Design a protein around this nucleic acid. Structure first.
Ligand SMILES: [Zn+2]
Ligand SMILES: [Zn+2]
Ligand SMILES: [Zn+2]
Ligand SMILES: [Zn+2]
Ligand SMILES: [Zn+2]
Length: 169
DNA sequence: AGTCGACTCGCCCTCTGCTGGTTAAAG
DNA sequence: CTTTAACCAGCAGAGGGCGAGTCGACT
């Protein structure tokens, strides 16, 4: 109460050091979940976790329909009504509602040697991983009822094969 | 008393991934 | 001009790490 053997404390309180040890060095994780293999250092965390199974959203935006699992997602939602933009690219001074959005802007706009993503099925590369997501869903997803070639009778079940086939035509 | 350890409530940060407007090239 | 799909900010999903304030419990 307090000092740390393996870290640079971060006094002071008996738990403010014990729990620190629990988080950063002795990964205790006493409380465990119902269905998943989850367990973590605080019960507050598990109470929050169980809503991913249940679906409880006990925090309403008095101004819209939204409802969040915990308090912070609502304070973060509130910025959209207030118009507050707390975050700032230090290079261009663009403003953003959300920290991670800013980090992503910096990564795509002011960063070099950043890794891309190559589609496994087709040969095109795109920058954000999530856009590789929408590309795999729109271009290499299974189309159940099929699509017919525009100029011949051949039917295809994936949009890529369809567009590729539409040659030499 | 005086010190916990356990209980609880709250602040703020990170990583992840989908959605829809824009834009620019290819039909 | 239309059609298309990557680019981009916006925005919501889950989880981690800290501060700090009540008490009954035990020396
Ligand atoms: Zn430490
Ligand atoms: Zn669970
Ligand atoms: Zn709202
Ligand atoms: Zn910038
Ligand atoms: Zn054909």
């Amino acid at each position: 109460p307090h000092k740390c053997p393996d870290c640079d404390m971060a006094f002071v309180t008996s738990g403010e050091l014990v729990r620190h040890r629990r988080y950063k060095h002795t990964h205790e994780k006493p409380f465990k979940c119902s269905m998943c293999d989850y367990a973590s250092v605080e019960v507050s965390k598990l109470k929050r976790h169980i809503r991913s199974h249940t679906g409880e959203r006990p925090f309403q935006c008095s101004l819209c329909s939204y409802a969040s699992r915990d308090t912070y997602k609502l304070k973060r939602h509130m910025r959209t009504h207030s118009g507050e933009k707390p975050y700032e690219c230090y290079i261009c001074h663009a403003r953003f509602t959300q920290s991670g959005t800013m980090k992503m802007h910096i990564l795509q706009k002011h960063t070099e040697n950043v890794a891309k993503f190559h589609c496994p099925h087709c040969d095109t590369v795109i920058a954000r991983k999530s856009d590789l997501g929408v590309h795999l869903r729109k271009q290499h997803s299974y189309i159940e009822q099929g699509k017919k070639c525009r100029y011949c009778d051949a039917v295809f079940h994936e949009r890529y094969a369809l567009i590729q086939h539409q040659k030499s035509h």
